[PDB]
Structure formats: structure tokens, C-alpha cells
Amino acid sequence: KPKGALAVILVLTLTILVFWLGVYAVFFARG
Amino acid sequence: SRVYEAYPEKKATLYFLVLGFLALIVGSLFGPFQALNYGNVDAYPLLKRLLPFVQSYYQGLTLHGVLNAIVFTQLFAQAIMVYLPARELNMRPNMGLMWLSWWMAFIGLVVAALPLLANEATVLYTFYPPLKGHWAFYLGASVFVLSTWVSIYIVLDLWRRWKAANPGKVTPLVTYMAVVFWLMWFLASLGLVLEAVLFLLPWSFGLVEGVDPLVARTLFWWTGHPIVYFWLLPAYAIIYTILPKQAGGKLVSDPMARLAFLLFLLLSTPVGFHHQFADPGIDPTWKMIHSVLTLFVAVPSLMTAFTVAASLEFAGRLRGGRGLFGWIRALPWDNPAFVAPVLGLLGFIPGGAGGIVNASFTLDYVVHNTAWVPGHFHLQVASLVTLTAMGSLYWLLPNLTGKPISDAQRRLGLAVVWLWFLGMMIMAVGLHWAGLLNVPRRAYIAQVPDAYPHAAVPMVFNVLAGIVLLVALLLFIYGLFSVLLSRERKPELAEAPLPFAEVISGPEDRRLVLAMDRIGFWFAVAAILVVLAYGPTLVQLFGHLNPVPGWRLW
Amino acid sequence: DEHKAHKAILAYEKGWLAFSLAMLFVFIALIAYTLATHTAGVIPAGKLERVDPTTVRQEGPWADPAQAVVQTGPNQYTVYVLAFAFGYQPNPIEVPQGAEIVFKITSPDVIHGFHVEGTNINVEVLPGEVSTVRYTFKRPGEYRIICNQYCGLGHQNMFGTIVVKE
Ligand code: HAS
Ligand code: HEM
Ligand SMILES: CCCCCCCC/C=C/CCCCCCCC(=O)OC[C@H](O)CO
Ligand SMILES: CCCCCCCC/C=C\CCCCCCCC(=O)OC[C@H](O)CO
Ligand SMILES: CCCCCCCC/C=C\CCCCCCCC(=O)OC[C@H](O)CO
Ligand SMILES: CCCCCCCC/C=C\CCCCCCCC(=O)OC[C@H](O)CO
Ligand SMILES: CCCCCCCC/C=C\CCCCCCCC(=O)OC[C@H](O)CO
Ligand SMILES: CCCCCCCC/C=C\CCCCCCCC(=O)OC[C@H](O)CO
Numbered sequence: 001k002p003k004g005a006l007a008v009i010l011v012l013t014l015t016i017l018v019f020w021l022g023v024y025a026v027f028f029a030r031g
Numbered sequence: 032s033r034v035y036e037a038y039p040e041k042k043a044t045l046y047f048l049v050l051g052f053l054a055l056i057v058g059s060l061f062g063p064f065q066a067l068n069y070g071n072v073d074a075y076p077l078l079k080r081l082l083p084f085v086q087s088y089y090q091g092l093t094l095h096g097v098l099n100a101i102v103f104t105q106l107f108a109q110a111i112m113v114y115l116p117a118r119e120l121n122m123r124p125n126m127g128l129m130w131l132s133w134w135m136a137f138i139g140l141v142v143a144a145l146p147l148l149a150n151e152a153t154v155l156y157t158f159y160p161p162l163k164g165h166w167a168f169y170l171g172a173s174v175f176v177l178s179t180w181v182s183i184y185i186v187l188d189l190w191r192r193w194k195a196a197n198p199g200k201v202t203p204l205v206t207y208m209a210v211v212f213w214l215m216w217f218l219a220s221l222g223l224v225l226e227a228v229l230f231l232l233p234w235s236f237g238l239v240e241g242v243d244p245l246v247a248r249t250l251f252w253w254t255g256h257p258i259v260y261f262w263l264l265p266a267y268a269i270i271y272t273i274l275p276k277q278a279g280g281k282l283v284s285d286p287m288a289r290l291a292f293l294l295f296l297l298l299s300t301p302v303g304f305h306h307q308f309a310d311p312g313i314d315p316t317w318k319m320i321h322s323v324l325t326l327f328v329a330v331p332s333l334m335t336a337f338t339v340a341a342s343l344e345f346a347g348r349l350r351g352g353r354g355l356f357g358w359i360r361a362l363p364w365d366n367p368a369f370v371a372p373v374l375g376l377l378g379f380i381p382g383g384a385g386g387i388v389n390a391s392f393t394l395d396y397v398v399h400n401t402a403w404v405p406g407h408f409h410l411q412v413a414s415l416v417t418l419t420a421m422g423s424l425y426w427l428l429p430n431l432t433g434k435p436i437s438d439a440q441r442r443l444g445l446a447v448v449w450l451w452f453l454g455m456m457i458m459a460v461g462l463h464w465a466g467l468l469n470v471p472r473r474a475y476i477a478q479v480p481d482a483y484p485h486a487a488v489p490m491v492f493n494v495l496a497g498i499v500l501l502v503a504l505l506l507f508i509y510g511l512f513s514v515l516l517s518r519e520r521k522p523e524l525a526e527a528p529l530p531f532a533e534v535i536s537g538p539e540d541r542r543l544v545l546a547m548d549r550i551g552f553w554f555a556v557a558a559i560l561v562v563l564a565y566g567p568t569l570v571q572l573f574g575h576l577n578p579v580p581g582w583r584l585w
Numbered sequence: 586d587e588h589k590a591h592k593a594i595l596a597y598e599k600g601w602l603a604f605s606l607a608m609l610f611v612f613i614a615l616i617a618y619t620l621a622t623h624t625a626g627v628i629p630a631g632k633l634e635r636v637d638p639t640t641v642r643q644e645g646p647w648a649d650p651a652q653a654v655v656q657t658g659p660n661q662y663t664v665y666v667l668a669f670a671f672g673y674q675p676n677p678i679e680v681p682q683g684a685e686i687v688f689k690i691t692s693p694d695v696i697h698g699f700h701v702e703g704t705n706i707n708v709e710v711l712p713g714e715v716s717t718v719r720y721t722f723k724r725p726g727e728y729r730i731i732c733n734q735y736c737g738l739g740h741q742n743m744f745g746t747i748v749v750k751e
């Protein structure tokens with residue numbers, strides 16, 4: 001298996017989620 | 032040189048790259064002053080002693096945006112996405128047309144630069160009416176962009192000539208990339224061409240009293256979204272088809288590389304209302320439909336993420352790397368042509384995460400027109416695209432000029448790309464965080480030093496970045512000039528093949544490849560999608576125009 | 586070996602792509618959700634509402650800023666706001682807490698932003714058009730309006746105030 005490529009797409013997932021859910025939480029906080 | 036007689040396309044490609052890097056240098060001079068400003072430090076007095084024609088922060092910001100994000104990126108895309116397919120096919124581009132495209136760009140640039148430099152078009156790189164710049168800025172710009180229609184013709188011509196000579200062969204990979212890319216660009220470019228011909232030009236000439244600002248922005252963003260994919264895709268063509276060789280491996284999938292580009296062709300253009308989430312007079316259903324389709328335009332980069340990572344990992348393993356991290360350490364980190372796109376891809380992970388945020392309709396109300404936005408786009412264009420082009424100094428330049436890169440120049444290029452990358456990451460932090468604190472973009476906030484007390488912390492990041500990037504820019508100017516004005520010429524370097532990667536061996540999926548080669552068809556699909564996504568709104572707007580008077584507020 | 590690495594790469598790539606698609610779909614569902622809630626009131630009205638920027642300060646609901654705030658329902662106020670070079674009228678906008686506010690904002694000159702700090706109100710203001718957005722202030726106090734669209738050399742100091750009365 002491409003363990004290295006998976007590690008990359010994991011970091012990318014976690015980044016996307018932190019950004020997206022972070023801003024979603026700010027959105028509601030300002031609602 | 033006997034090399035330019037056999038490959039005259041090398042000289043024209045060099046002229047595009049050089050002029051591109053000169054615009055980047057000029058436009059970038061303003062970037063450190065702007066990072067200091069977003070760090071609440073006012074260095075404009077210094078800048079004005081140095082460059083006495085600069086009348087304001089906002090004239091500096093117009094120059095920075097137009098030179099770096101419009102001019103540099105386009106010239107790079109014209110160099111890469113003509114010369115690479117031409118070398119892959121081993122065929123000469125129509126040289127009359129190649130030079131015509133160059134001179135159109137040069138002349139368009141010179142004519143726009145006049146009013147920009149004279150403080151007659153301080154309207155930024157978006158030039159939103161009713162702010163009213165000098166007609167020459169709109170005319171110079173229109174001619175500059177129209178240069179690219181010539182490039183499109185050049186590549187479609189190459190492709191057709193090749194296909195005539197090779198009936199029933201599938202399009203070679205880099206040429207397939209460039210064909211879908213330039214056809215995507217053609218459909219993308221129509222928004223701005225319409226906006227300029229139908230409104231901005233008659234208006235700045237004095238022919239019509241006003242322009243309707245909503246129609247003007249809508250037609251602007253029809254083009255303003257796909258133009259960023261037009262910046263990005265030349266860096267992607269190198270990242271897929273060149274970087275894996277530089278990394279010491281191979282491209283792990285030709286079909287997955289073609290599929291990403293076909294997804295860009297279909298999805299780059301019908302999504303621009305994601306720049307208009309906060310605009311009146313556009314129906315929220317259609318905002319949602321562009322939001323979904325924008326989330327889909329994300330998928331080709333999500334696919335790129337994996338295909339490219341797996342290609343790098345494969346290279347690292349070929350070079351002996353083992354573990355879960357050994358593959359990374361084994362890669363050629365002494366080679367600036369390898370390092371620069373890799374670092375740019377690392378910063379693209381937060382860059383793309385912020386883009387997916389921005390795309391998410393109601394989430395955009397948190398960040399719109401704040402510093403977050405420049406935080407996102409410095410990661411995408413000012414970091415990945417720019418670093419990839421900088422890394423080309425190190426394989427492409429020698430190939431075009433025969434001029435060797437010395438050991439010392441190599442190490443200097445290493446330091447430049449690292450400082451540039453790290454400076455972009457630090458500023459991304461300061462700008463994303465100031466944006467979440469409601470600091471607006473496009474603002475000389477250093478002139479209102481008590482307006483933003485809550486942003487004190489990320490402001491330190493922007494100062495630091497402004498200094499780190501000043502140093503990276505100075506070293507880059509020094510480096511580029513050392514390599515350009517260099518003594519030695521080794522003609523064999525200009526005759527060496529480009530460093531194009533092989534593709535990993537494995538079936539693969541002919542029929543998918545054959546299906547994606549149905550370019551006429553995929554193009555009509557892309558174009559249908561634009562009528563579907565834009566038509567209904569533009570019918571309504573054009574049937575209810577409300578033009579308004581022009582202003583000069585500088 | 587190459588055959589085997591290639592096979593494995595394509596297999597796990599298929600898996601990532603499905604996951605990445607799943608994730609994007611969840612975001613699309615989560616956005617859908619916001620659009621069904623009161624938070625979606627800041628999305629501007631889609632309907633075109635054309636006005637004339639050259640006479641907006643002489644006739645119509647923007648001509649007398651002291652009359653800008655109009656009760657339009659039992660818990661609703663419409664506020665006629667002018668964003669202009671380089672200021673907002675009325676100044677301050679005064680509204681009661683916990684009421685639904687329908688801001689109707691236009692400009693007599695260039696595009697301005699209208700970004701109410703601490704809220705999701707963030708709307709472009711186009712001359713000739715009226716931007717309509719809706720919000721209910723839950724907390725009383727002073728809210729700063731920032732112009733977040735470059736409107737000329739006075740842009741960085743173009744601010745206004747909303748006072749939400751207890
Ligand atoms: C080249 C330049 C650009 C790219 C690319 C770009 C991509 C996107 N953008 Fe954007 N953007 C927006 C949405 C997105 C979306 C969804 C994406 C996507 O296409 C992003 C997808 C990409 C990813 C999901 C990341 C994939 C990760 C990769 C491919 C790296 C992998 C790592 C590897 C392989 C390395 C591993 C190796 C090792 C050794 C470990 C939105 C709205 O939805 C706005 C308007 C916001 C507003 O309010 O104004 C916006 C505003 C802008 C502006 C401001 C325009 C202005 O002046 O007003 C620019 C210039 C810009 C540029 C660019 N943007 N963007
Ligand atoms: C030394 C490098 C650079 C630094 C320090 C820098 C810094 C900045 C800063 C701080 C801003 C925000 C200013 C404002 O909102 O008022 C800005 C705007 C911008 N930058 Fe850069 N920049 C640099 C290089 C790049 C390059 C290479 C690109 C493109 C390839 C670029 C494209 C842009 C654009 C498009 C704008 C926005 C212009 C506008 O809003 O009208 N920058 N940059
Ligand atoms: C290789 C390139 C990397 C370059 C890295 C550069 C690091 C910047 C300096 C850090 C030392 C700390 C110096 C700060 C001391 C003075 C602080 C100060 O006075 O603040 C600014 C002034 O107040 C505003 O008007
Ligand atoms: C290899 C590439 C890796 C690239 C990865 C980069 C992505 C960064 C993501 C998140 C940083 C978030 C920092 C921590 C979150 C801050 C939240 C917080 O403290 O919120 C304030 C709250 O209101 C209390 O005052
Ligand atoms: C490495 C260089 C890349 C640059 C990386 C940019 C960093 C921005 C990161 C994450 C955004 C997440 C949003 C943070 C949200 C925290 C606040 C929160 O959780 O909201 C609740 C609070 O009550 C609300 O007012
Ligand atoms: C505020 C944020 C500022 C900090 C931004 C940092 C973000 C990530 C840092 C570096 C990425 C480089 C990752 C990979 C570096 C690998 C180098 C390596 O493994 O070197 C091998 C050795 O030299 C034999 O070649
Ligand atoms: C040797 C190379 C490494 C050296 C690089 C340092 C590494 C990172 C840390 C700090 C730099 C901060 C520099 C910022 C300088 C001035 C900050 C400022 O303007 O202070 C505002 C204050 O909060 C309002 O009173
Ligand atoms: C709340 C959300 C949770 C976030 C937490 C991070 C999630 C991990 C991310 C991506 C996994 C993508 C890789 C999918 C692996 C697919 C398996 C596969 O394809 O395996 C086939 C192979 O042949 C076997 O034999």
C-alpha cells in the first residue's frame with residue numbers, strides 16, 4: 001500500500017476539516 | 032546560435048519567461064510594504080523616497096495585483112503550455128503566431144502600465160465599476176489578455192497537425208493537458224472579453240455614461256474564477272509530467288493525470304458566483320448551485336494530491352527510503368527544481384482548505400473581503416504557482432539558453448525558494464488570523480493604527496513575513512540576474528531533452544483514455560455547463576440594466 | 586513490483602477519492618442546513634431592486650437619515666442605510682435588541698462593503714442597487730461597520746456604528 005501518499009491525504013483531510021468546522025463554528029457563533 | 036535556428040520556439044519561450052519574471056519582480060517590490068502595512072507598520076514614506084511616482088498604498092496594490100497575478104502568471108502559462116507540448120510532440124509551433132502573441136502581450140503591458148504608473152487607474156486588479164480608470168488601462172489589459180487567444184490557436188494547430196500524422200493514436204499526455212487547458216481558457220476568457228467590449232471600453236472612451244456594476248462584476252467573475260485555474264494548470268503540467276523525473280521516480284498514472292485536467296476543463300468556469308455570495312440581485316438558489324459545483328472543482332486537486340503524493344513516495348522508495356517518513360528524506364532536497372514545487376504543494380494543503388471554506392456559501396460571510404482571502408490566495412498563486420515557475424529557472428532556463436547553473440547559483444536558488452515558501456506560510460498565518468478577526472482586505476490599515484487592537488498578534492506575523500519576503504525577493508533578483516547575465520554558454524544544455532517523466536508500467540485503462548480523448552465532445556459539455564450555470568442569471572441581468580456614473584476617488 | 590506498486594496505488598486512490606467525495610457531500614449537507622435556519626437571513630435578497638444613485642440623497646427613503654429606521658412588523662424594523670465616500674448614514678444606526686432588522690443599503694457613488702463586526706452581516710453595496718439583508722441582534726451594545734470593499738483613498742477610515750438598544 002502507498003502508506004506515504006495516505007499519510008499526505010490524512011494531513012490534507014485533517015486540515016480541510018479543521019478549517020471547515022472551525023469556520024462553521026464561527027459562523028454560528030456570529031449568527 | 033545554431034540552436035535557435037533549429038528551435039526558434041526556445042527564443043520566443045525565453046522572451047515570455049523573462050518578461051514574466053520582470054513583472055513578478057516589479058509587482059513583488061510592493062508586497063513587503065503591504066505585509067508591513069498588514070503588520071500595522073507604515074513604510075510607505077520610505078517606499079515613496081525610493082519610488083517617487085508612487086502616490087498611495089492603493090496605487091502600489093494595483094501594481095502588485097496586476098503585475099504579479101495577471102501579467103506574470105499569464106506569461107508563464109504562455110511559455111509552459113506552448114513550449115512543453117511542442118517539445119513532447121517534437122514539432123515547431125507556428126512561429127509567426129508565437130511572436131505575434133509575445134508582442135501583443137508586451138504592447139498590451141506597456142499601454143496599461145502608462146496610466147497605472149501615472150496614478151490614472153488606481154482601481155486594483157479587479158477594476159470594479161464605478162471606479163473609473165483611464166481607457167488605456169482597459170485597452171492595454173484587453174490586448175494583453177487577447178494575446179492568449181493566439182496561444183490557444185497555436186496549440187490547437189500543433190495538436191491537429193500531430194493527429195493528422197498519427198490517425199487513431201491517443202493524444203500524448205502533455206499535449207492532452209495543454210489542449211483541454213487552452214480550450215478551458217477560451218470558454219473562461221469570454222466573461223471578461225464581454226465585460227470589456229460591451230461595457231468597460233465604451234465607458235472609458237466616453238461612449239456610454241455609466242456601467243451597471245452588478246452585470247460588470249458577474250461577467251468579471253465568469254472569467255475571474257477560471258483565470259486562477261489558468262494560473263495553476265501550467266504548474267500542474269510540470270508537477271505531473273516533469274517533477275516525478277526530478278524526484279527520481281515516474282508519474283504513477285497517466286489516466287488519473289488526464290482525468291484531473293478533463294475535470295478542470297468541465298468545472299473551472301461555471302462557478303464564479305462564489306465570488307458573489309455577498310452581491311445583491313443574484314438569486315440564492317443559483318449561489319447554492321455554484322457553491323456545489325465549486326466543491327466539485329475541488330475534486331481534481333484532491334485527485335492531484337494523491338496521484339502526486341504517490342508519485343513522490345514511489346520516487347523516495349526507488350531512492351532507498353523506507354519507514355513511513357524515509358521516502359520523504361530520500362528525495363532530492365538539494366535540487367531547487369524539485370524543492371520549489373514540493374514546498375508550493377505543501378502550502379497548497381491549507382491554501383485548498385481555505386478555498387473549500389470560501390466556496391461554502393454562508394461560510395463565506397465569515398471571511399469575505401477580509402484578510403483571510405489574501406491569506407488563501409498567497410498560498411495558491413503567490414506560493415505554489417510562483418515557486419513552481421522559480422524552480423523552472425533551474426531546468427528550463429538552461430534548456431532555453433544553454434547557460435549552466437553553477438553549484439553556487441543552485442544553493443542560492445535553494446535559499447530563495449525556502450525563504451519565499453516560509454515567508455508565504457508565515458504571512459498566510461497572519462492574514463487568515465487577521466481575517467477571522469474582521470480586518471478588511473485592500474486597506475492601508477497602518478494609517479489607522481488604533482482601528483484593529485484585537486489583531487495585534489497576527490500583525491507580528493505579517494511584519495515578519497514582510498521582512499523574510501523582502502530578503503527572499505532581493506536574493507531572487509540577484510539570482511535571476513546572475514543566471515541571466517551569466518558568462519558561460521554550453522550549447523549541449525540547450526539541446527538536451529526536457530526532463531519529462533516516464534509513466535509507471537501497468538495495464539492501464541484504455542477506453543477511459545480513449546473516452547477522455549473525445550475532446551470535441553468534452554469541450555461541448557464544458558460549454559453547455561456554462562450556459563446552464565450562467566445563462567438564466569445573465570438573461571435576467573441584461574434585461575434589467577441600471578448603468579450608473581463613474582468615479583475617481585484617488 | 587512496478588506492476589504491484591501501480592495496482593496498489595490505484596486501489597487506495599479509488600478509496601481516497603470516495604472518502605474525499607463523502608466529505609464534500611457532508612459539507613454540502615451542512616451548508617444546506619444553514620440555509621434552512623435564521624442565520625441565512627444575511628444572504629442578500631436575490632430580487633433586483635433598482636434605484637438611482639444620483640438622487641438617492643434628495644428623494645426617497647435615504648434622503649433623511651433621521652427617518653431611516655421604520656417599524657415594518659410587530660418585531661421588525663427596516664433600516665435605510667447609505668454607504669458613501671466615506672461614511673454611513675445614519676450614524677449611528679439605532680435598533681432594538683431581539684428585533685428582526687431588514688437593512689436596505691445603497692451607495693450614491695462607488696461600491697462599498699458593509700461588514701458588521703461580530704455578525705455574519707457582510708454585503709457588497711452597489712450604486713443603483715439595493716442590498717437587503719436580515720439579522721436579529723441578540724446582544725445589546727455598539728457594533729462597528731467596516732467598509733471592506735476598496736472605494737478609494739478614504740477606504741481604510743470608512744467606518745460606521747450600529748447601537749443595539751436594550
Ligand atoms: C492559483 C490561484 C488559485 C487557486 C488554485 C484557488 C483554488 C480555490 N479557490 Fe481561490 N477562492 C475561492 C475558492 C477556491 C476553491 C474551492 C479552490 C480549490 O480549487 C482548492 C482545491 C485544492 C485542494 C483541496 C488542496 C489539494 C492539495 C494538494 C494538491 C497538495 C498536496 C500535497 C502534496 C502532493 C505534497 C506531498 C509531499 C511531501 C514531501 C510530503 C473562493 C470562493 O469559493 C473565493 C472567494 C472568497 C471571497 O469571499 O472573496 C476565492 C478567492 C481567491 C482569490 C481572490 C480573488 C479576489 O481578488 O477577490 C484568488 C486570487 C484565489 C486564487 C486561487 N484559488 N482565490
Ligand atoms: C514578496 C511577496 C509578496 C508579498 C509580501 C505579498 C503581500 C501581499 C499582501 C500583504 C497583500 C494584501 C494587501 C491588501 O489586501 O491590501 C497582497 C495582495 C495581493 N497579492 Fe501579494 N505579495 C507577494 C507576492 C505575491 C505574488 C507573487 C502574487 C501573485 C503571483 C501576489 C498576488 C497578490 C494579489 C492578487 C493581491 C490582491 C490585490 C488586490 O486585492 O487588489 N502577491 N500581497
Ligand atoms: C534570512 C532572512 C530571515 C530574516 C528574519 C528577520 C527576523 C526579524 C528580526 C528579528 C529580531 C527582533 C528584532 C525586533 C526588535 C525591534 C522591534 C521594534 O522596535 O518594533 C518595530 C517598530 O516598533 C515598528 O515601528
Ligand atoms: C504538511 C502540511 C501541514 C499544513 C497544516 C496547516 C493547517 C493549520 C490548521 C489549523 C491550525 C489551527 C490552530 C489552532 C486553532 C485555533 C482555535 C482557537 O484558539 O480559537 C480561538 C477561540 O475563540 C479561543 O479564544
Ligand atoms: C501553515 C500556513 C497555513 C495557514 C493556516 C491558516 C490558519 C487558519 C486555520 C484554521 C481556521 C479555523 C477557524 C478557527 C475557529 C476558532 C474559533 C471557534 O472555534 O469558534 C467558536 C467561537 O466562539 C467563535 O466566536
Ligand atoms: C508559521 C509557519 C511557518 C513554518 C512553515 C513550515 C511548514 C512545513 C515546514 C517545512 C516543510 C518541508 C517538509 C519536508 C522537509 C524535508 C527535508 C528532508 O527530509 O531533508 C532530507 C535531508 O536533507 C537529505 O536530503
Ligand atoms: C536568525 C533568524 C530568525 C529571526 C526571526 C525571528 C523568528 C520569529 C520570531 C519573531 C520575529 C518578530 C519580528 C517582528 C518585529 C516587530 C513587531 C512589532 O511591530 O511589534 C508590535 C507590538 O505588538 C505593538 O506594540
Ligand atoms: C469525521 C471524519 C473522520 C476523519 C478522520 C480521517 C479519515 C482518513 C482519511 C482518508 C481515508 C482515505 C483512504 C481510503 C482507504 C480505502 C481502502 C481501499 O481502497 O483499499 C483497497 C485495497 O485493495 C485494500 O486491499
Ligand SMILES: CCCCCCCC/C=C\CCCCCCCC(=O)OC[C@H](O)CO
Pocket residue numbers: 028611614615618622
Ligand atoms: C456510513 C455512515 C454515514 C453517516 C455519516 C453522516 C455524517 C454526519 C455529519 C453531519 C450531519 C449533519 C448534522 C446536521 C445538524 C447540524 C446542526 C447544527 O450544527 O446546528 C447549528 C445551530 O446550533 C442551530 O441553528
Ligand SMILES: CCCCCCCC/C=C\CCCCCCCC(=O)OC[C@H](O)CO
Pocket residue numbers: 026029030460463464467468702703704724725726727728729
Ligand atoms: C493558526 C491560526 C490561528 C487562528 C486563531 C483564530 C481566532 C478566531 C477568533 C475569533 C472569531 C470569533 C468571532 C465571534 C464574534 C463575536 C464578536 C462580538 O461580540 O462583537 C461585538 C459586540 O458589539 C459586543 O456587544
Ligand code: CUA
Pocket residue numbers: 669670671696697698732733734735736737739740741743
Ligand atoms: Cu467604502 Cu471602502
Ligand SMILES: [O-][O-]
Pocket residue numbers: 255256259386
Ligand atoms: O478564484 O478562487
Ligand SMILES: [Cu+2]
Pocket residue numbers: 255256257259303305306
Ligand atoms: Cu473563484
